[PDB]
């Protein structure tokens, strides 16, 4: 495979192959108890080395399902019901919000001696996450789990349990990250005393051996950005080439995916650049030929633009080009046209907002909004990250990325309120109103507290649609599908509060990046 301890690793090439089998054996273990085979395909997705056991967690569930697995318990155990429900769905299995409706009295509430389990509600709370439109238990779920949660006390559960809870209430599993589940699940897993010692050691070894890969790909990328130079010459602009490739690893975790990584990380320094630029450095006359550059894509005509936006414009028009080059190289197609539409319109977003800030304009959220996650840049990552994911181009697919299908913009609908939403009180309080959120409160004339609770349910909203169309009914691979959710999920670890905002940013990166794993003991 692309991702075996042979075509990365190579000895520890030979401690992993042992340790990796001896995993594989025991989630092929036909003898082992369901509800105890769950709880291991738990622990190893969570651990971070889902992706290595994809084929047999599927084998797995497939003997549950069809033996039935405890269809009984599921009236027994709310917890053995809980994580069943949440692990078959995400592998798409089909499963009905009614397979909790047993855990409900006359009047139709979840019985109260629930709570008493802390682990059950855990449980069930991570599952309400993988909900979709209509699934009002699940919802009624959550907001019951939540409740009960809230209250737990590290004196009530414990220490560790504890632990669990703040995690869970931080950000679910659902909407974390897969490398920062990782780091948390590893430490979290190695101190307790029951920790199955050849699987610990498996996920330290295959994290370091994976950051290992994201060192390398950093490397050279960041070769690039040095060549490139581009916030030395311009005083102004901002250097984000770390931020990025952590950003991207959030997309793309898979080592496989070092292109993917190194398309997005690249992307996204260049929209920090050119995002200043219009917002802050340039002025509107500049801003539109920039813009109209961008559209003819004419190098001949670099002249035509400011100094310092003609060094700007080479740098970007090279590095897509060079993109353009490698694909036609890879699959023998020409996908120019797509990447600069994409750029095409992301800087047509930008100045939209350029226009709206210098003219005083006051747009009512939905035309705010629907213009704010096309200037995320979010659709344009992901278009990146589709040529660069997925082998086989399919003309049907791009068409419909070029129209911004809902792959595509739904997680981006997330990007840009989880992003206004850290910066909503002070743009605020600072009289601004280029800010979701403060469109919200004037277009629905409310309180800033109400105009937040609306966008966060405007989230949970967005994640239902979306965990539809990975579910089923989809014209795109679950691969991309997953990596365009992806960037949901990032921005969510993104844009937090935390310790300090900076500190535990600064903390992950290092652990995501920079910092190995302490070594197994
Ligand atoms: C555009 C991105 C992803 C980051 C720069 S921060 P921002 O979203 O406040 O910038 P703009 O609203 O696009 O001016
Ligand atoms: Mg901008
Ligand atoms: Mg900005
Ligand atoms: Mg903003």
Redesign the pocket.
């Known amino acids: 495979n692309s991702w075996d301890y042979d075509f990365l690793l190579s000895v520890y090439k030979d401690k992993a192959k042992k340790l990796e089998a001896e995993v594989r054996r025991e989630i092929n273990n036909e003898k082992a108890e369901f509800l105890t085979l769950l709880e291991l395909i738990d622990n190893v997705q969570r651990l971070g080395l889902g992706y290595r056991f994809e084929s047999d967690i599927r084998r797995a569930l497939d003997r549950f399902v069809s033996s039935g697995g405890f269809d009984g318990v599921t009236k027994t155990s709310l917890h053995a019901t809980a994580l069943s429900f949440r692990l078959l769905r995400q592998h798409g299995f089909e499963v009905s919000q009614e397979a909790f409706s047993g855990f409900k009295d006359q009047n139709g509430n979840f019985l109260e001696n629930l709570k008493e389990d802390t682990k059950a509600i855990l449980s069930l709370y991570e599952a309400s996450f993988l909900a979709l439109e209509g699934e009002n238990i699940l919802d009624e779920a959550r907001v019951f789990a939540i409740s009960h949660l809230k209250e737990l006390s590290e004196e009530k559960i414990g220490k560790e349990l504890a632990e669990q809870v703040n995690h869970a209430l931080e950000l679910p599993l659902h909407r974390r990250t897969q490398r920062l589940e990782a780091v948390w699940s590893i430490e979290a897993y190695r101190k307790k005393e029951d920790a199955n010692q050849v699987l610990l050691e498996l996920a330290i070894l295959d994290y370091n051996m994976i950051q290992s890969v994201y060192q390398r790909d950093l490397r050279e990328t960041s070769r690039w950005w040095r060549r490139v130079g581009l916030a030395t010459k311009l005083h102004f602009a901002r250097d984000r080439l770390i931020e990025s490739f952590y950003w991207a690893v959030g997309v793309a975790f898979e080592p496989q995916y070092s292109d993917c990584r190194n398309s997005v990380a690249k992307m ?1 320094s260049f ?2 650049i050119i ?2 630029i ?3 450095y340039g002025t509107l006359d500049e801003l539109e030929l920039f813009t109209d550059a961008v559209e003819r894509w004419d190098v001949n005509a670099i002249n035509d633009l400011p100094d310092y936006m003609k060094l700007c414009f080479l740098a970007l028009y090279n590095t897509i080009n060079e993109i353009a080059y490698d694909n036609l190289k890879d699959k023998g197609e020409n996908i120019l046209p797509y990447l600069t539409k994409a750029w095409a319109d992301l800087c047509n ?2 100045l939209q ?2 226009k709206w ?1 210098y003219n005083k304009s006051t747009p009512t959220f939905d035309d705010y909004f629907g213009n ?1 996650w096309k ?4 659709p344009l990552q992901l278009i990146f990250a589709y040529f660069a994911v997925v082998q086989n181009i399919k003309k049907e697919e791009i068409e419909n990325l070029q129209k911004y299908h809902d792959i595509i913009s739904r997680p981006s609908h997330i ?2 309120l989880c ?2 939403l850290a ?1 909503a009180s002070a ?1 605020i309080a600072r009289g601004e109103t ?2 979701s959120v403060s469109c919200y409160m004037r277009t629905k004339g409310i309180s800033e507290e109400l105009a937040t609770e609306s966008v966060m349910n405007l989230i949970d909203e967005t994640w239902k649609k979306m965990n539809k169309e990975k579910l089923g009914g989809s014209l795109f691979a679950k691969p991309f599908v997953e990596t365009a959710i992806n960037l949901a999920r990032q921005s969510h670890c993104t844009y937090h509060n935390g310790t300090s905002p900076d500190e535990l940013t600064r903390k992950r990166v290092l652990s995501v990046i920079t910092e190995p794993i302490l070594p197994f003991e």
Request: charged share 25%.
């Open positions: 996204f929209v920090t995002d200043d219009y917002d802050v977003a930008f907002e350029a800030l704010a200037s995320s840049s979010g990007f840009r992003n206004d910066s743009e280029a800010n």
